[PDB]
């Protein structure tokens, strides 16, 4: 065979030649043998692509190896390799490129890898949270397509328990002002974040958030590898757990595994139904392989269960599965490993774990809040509403049994007439509803800051303006839209409301 590879330096080329020669010595082709070749990247792209096309396709190469140079250009190595490989629908192997935009087998019709991109390690999040009594995550994600994929994967890998994350708020990639997201995040009972995004934005959010003291006691943070890197291990408050992979930028092992897989696939494919030959020359032929999908399909079906990196098991989307990761604690700016990821199992090490704050416990991302803001609409017979006078309280009125009327302020609107803006004047609502309100408030021992709603309706279900997307407006709507928990008022139990919500047992009959 005449396999081809695109490398960064000559030691890499020598290593590749040694690996393919060792593969031949262990097991080799009958007559075609295993010839090999490696070239070097050029910082011209267009000319590097011209070079790889001409030379490699003229070389009758059967597999193409591409490795990410350690230089962080991020669109240097795999950007022209997979495209022109797919022009002839010939598969490529990934060595040290670990983004997830390539995992989508749509445009890069040919792409493999042995470095599970950063969407994979989102699986580690559930692989751990399976048994931790951790049930409230408001994780932040950037607008990068990597972050997009990691997000969607995390939502879809959590529905097996039918649970749901609270906030999945998101932000533009690599910005320098993220304080907002944070002070709305802190005004939530939830106290866990699984933010995982670009390193620069990670440092930005750390710097802007530590000012808000949310890094203090009982507020954990969850972050993966690439988000603690270069400019991020600095601003990190203690306790930030790190999630990293076992075999890092060691090219040799991955070159070995890739060439072993390619050699095994070609040797088994030497016997097959029909094997055609690559078109000769980058120019000329304008037609695809007659058998390229055969080579690719047998390449996914590759159980190469022997290697330096163990079993290089590949998943369905042309990537690598069955990887080993690491949970590592950040102990006083001195990072040391704190967990292991052998896959579907966790074996925490015998160490003194540390969180932010400084307690040595299981900080609760959950809370009782005990605020319970209340809303209610004024009909008439169950709530009497009176504009309180300029006296700081409602009034004092009495009853027959010597029991005066309870009265509390009610921060309702003042826009009953359409067009007038809601002055939100603090009127005084009272009566039957306030009576049940105060009794139940004493029952549960909390506080209320009651206020009405602007529109003044029960808020049925309807459609948004000129669209088939449905919604709930009005009072029920402000219940759903996390604006208050209790809306106690005369509201009818019906079907469409109860089909997707839960009601207390009724307190009346009508």
């Amino acid at each position, epitope marked *: 065979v005449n396999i081809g590879a695109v490398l960064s330096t000559r030691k890499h080329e020598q290593m590749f030649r040694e690996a393919v020669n060792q593969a031949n010595k262990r097991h080799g082709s009958w007559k075609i043998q295993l010839n090999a070749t490696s070239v070097t990247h050029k910082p011209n792209a267009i000319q590097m692509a011209l070079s790889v096309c001409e030379d490699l396709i003229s070389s009758q190469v059967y597999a193409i190896l591409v490795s990410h140079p350690p230089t962080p250009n991020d669109h240097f190595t795999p950007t022209p390799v997979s495209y022109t490989a797919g022009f002839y629908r010939i598969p490529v192997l990934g060595l040290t490129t670990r983004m997830s935009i390539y995992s989508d087998k749509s445009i890069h019709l040919s792409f493999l890898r042995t470095v599970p991109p950063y969407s994979h390690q989102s699986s580690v999040w559930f692989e751990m949270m399976r048994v931790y009594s951790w049930n409230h995550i408001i994780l932040l994600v950037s607008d990068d397509h990597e972050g997009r994929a990691a997000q969607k994967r995390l939502e879809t890998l959590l529905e097996e328990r039918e649970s749901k994350a609270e906030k999945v708020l998101q932000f533009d990639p690599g910005t320098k002002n993220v304080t907002a997201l944070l002070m709305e995040a802190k005004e939530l009972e939830a106290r866990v974040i699984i933010l995982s995004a670009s390193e620069d934005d990670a440092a930005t959010v750390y710097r802007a958030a530590a000012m808000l003291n949310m890094t203090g006691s009982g507020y954990v943070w969850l972050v993966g590898e690439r988000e603690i890197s*270069g400019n991020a*291990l600095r601003y990190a408050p203690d306790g930030i757990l790190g999630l990293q992979l076992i075999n890092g930028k060691n090219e040799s092992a991955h070159i070995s595994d890739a060439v072993g897989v390619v050699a095994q696939a070609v040797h088994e494919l030497l016997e097959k139904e029909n094997i055609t030959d690559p078109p000769r020359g980058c120019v000329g032929n304008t037609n695809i392989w007659k058998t390229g999908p055969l080579f690719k399909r047998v390449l996914m079906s590759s159980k190469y269960a022997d290697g330096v990196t163990g079993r290089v098991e590949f998943n369905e989307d042309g990537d690598r599965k069955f990887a080993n990761y690491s949970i590592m604690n950040l*102990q006083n700016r001195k990072l040391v490993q704190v967990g292991i990821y052998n896959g579907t199992h966790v074996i925490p090490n015998d160490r003194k774990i540390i969180w932010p704050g400084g307690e040595t416990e299981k900080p609760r991302g959950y809370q009782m809040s005990t605020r319970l803001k209340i809303v209610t609409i004024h009909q008439e017979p169950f709530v009497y509403v009176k504009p309180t006078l300029s006296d700081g309280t409602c009034k004092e009125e009495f009853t027959v049994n010597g029991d005066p009327v309870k009265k509390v302020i009610c921060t309702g609107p003042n826009d009953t007439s359409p067009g007038s803006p809601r002055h939100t004047v603090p009127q005084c609502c009272y009566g039957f509803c306030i009576d049940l309100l105060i009794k139940l408030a004493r029952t549960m021992n909390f506080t209320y800051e009651v206020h009405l709603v602007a529109d003044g309706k029960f808020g049925t279900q309807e459609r948004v303006n000129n669209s088939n997307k449905k919604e709930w407006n009005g009072m029920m709507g402000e219940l759903l839209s996390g604006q208050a928990d209790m809306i106690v008022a005369p509201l009818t139990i019906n079907n469409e409301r109860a089909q997707y919500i839960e009601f207390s047992k009724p307190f009346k009959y009508q």
Partner: antibody, heavy 117, light 109 residues
Framework: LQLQESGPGLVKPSQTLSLTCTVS?????????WSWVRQPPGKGLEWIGE???????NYNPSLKSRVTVSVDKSKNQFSLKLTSVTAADTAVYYC?????????????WGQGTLVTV | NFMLTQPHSVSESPGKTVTISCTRS????????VQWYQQRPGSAPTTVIY?????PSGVPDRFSGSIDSSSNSASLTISGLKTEDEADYYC?????????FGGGTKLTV
């Protein structure tokens, strides 16, 4: 809040020296660590390691299989168990407090002894 | 890891502005910062500037740190040279592996 390394000058070779460091004005039950950076004589410095009051510790990778440090709250003091002491210990030992903070850094150093084997 | 470089010393009269520059051998001085100690001869070390941005309580405005990160020279300034400043000046930094210290800097006034 003042440190003091107990062992003044015990420099017995081929043995297990035990320099014990205690503090006044406070106790170890806090969120901070401890430091025993070593100064070669007439030369620069040489970090040894650092310990935590409750569970863990960490040292310079230059010296791993030889340093074992413990801490006791009852005596409010912490000491090492260095094994097979050699002539390399001809260098002054210190005991400085540190602050976790945002940057690893020692609070002003201790009195320092003159332990040189 | 990575060592530093302060050759041995420097000598100048009061009224000048001269101080050694701590240099990071491997990598750049941008992630894990630098910090200068003052250690009077025959005595224990004590801080003089922290992260080369602010000075500890009691340290005069005479000392001030600055960062270039291009030559990786962690610059220190003792502008306002006088006599009492005779001590050792030790640059220190740190990483997930180790904390490392300078060779020392004792000036002649």
């Amino acid at each position: 809040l003042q440190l003091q390394e107990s062992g003044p000058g015990l420099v017995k070779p081929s043995q297990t020296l035990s320099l014990t460091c205690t503090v006044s004005g406070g106790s170890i039950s806090s969120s901070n660590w401890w430091s025993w950076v070593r100064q070669p004589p007439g030369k620069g410095l040489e970090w040894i390691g650092e310990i935590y009051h409750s569970g863990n510790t960490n040292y310079n990778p230059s010296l791993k299989s030889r340093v074992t440090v413990s801490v006791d709250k009852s005596k409010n003091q912490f000491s090492l168990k260095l094994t097979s002491v050699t002539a390399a210990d001809t260098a002054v030992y210190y005991c400085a407090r540190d602050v976790s903070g945002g940057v690893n850094w020692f609070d002003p150093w201790g009195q320092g002894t003159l332990v040189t084997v | 890891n990575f060592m530093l470089t302060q050759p041995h010393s420097v000598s100048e009269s009061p009224g000048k502005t001269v101080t050694i520059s701590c240099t990071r051998s491997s990598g750049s001085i941008a992630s894990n910062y630098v910090q200068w100690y003052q250690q009077r001869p025959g005595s224990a070390p004590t801080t003089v500037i922290y992260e080369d941005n602010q000075r500890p309580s009691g340290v005069p405005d005479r000392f001030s740190g600055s960062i270039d990160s291009s030559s990786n020279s962690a610059s220190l300034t003792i502008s306002g040279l006088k006599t009492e400043d005779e001590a050792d000046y030790y640059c220190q930094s740190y990483d997930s592996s180790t904390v490392v210290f300078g060779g020392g800097t004792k000036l002649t006034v």
